[PDB]
Amino acid sequence: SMNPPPPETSNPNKPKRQTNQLQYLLRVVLKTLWKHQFAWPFQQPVDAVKLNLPDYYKIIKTPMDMGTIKKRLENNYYWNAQECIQDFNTMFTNCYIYNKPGDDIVLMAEALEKLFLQKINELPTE
């Protein structure tokens, strides 16, 4: 019924490092996906109450969204680019699990994922 709290985005106990791949994930990948025409349902956690999707968090137990990824990148929450890439993949997979193939939101996520993969293919070395 109710929304869960959003995913955690900061942890002062976790170690921190800035890498060129994490910098690319924020300044290129996140920035580019955020401005896509289809980004807005993915810019914040799914509000299943407001969207009237009462079973959403009965089905989706690893919610993820780009608003959370943006804060995680800003707060140096990730040690590895791969952790951030996994969050993007979780966001897309969540949409494909909850929604019927071919639904409007699924086509929107598919377009975002294609652009994501294009940018991930140009992830710099190190």
Ligand SMILES: CCOc1ccc(C(C)=O)cc1-c1cc(NC(=O)c2ccco2)cc(-c2ccn(C)n2)c1
């Ligand atoms: C009907 C089922 O809709 C959904 C089901 C599941 C999911 C997820 C994320 O699994 C998302 C939607 C969804 C949400 C929103 N709008 C926002 O999330 C929003 C709006 C403002 C702030 O946030 C819009 C559209 C939509 C589809 C076509 N158009 C033109 N618009 C679809």
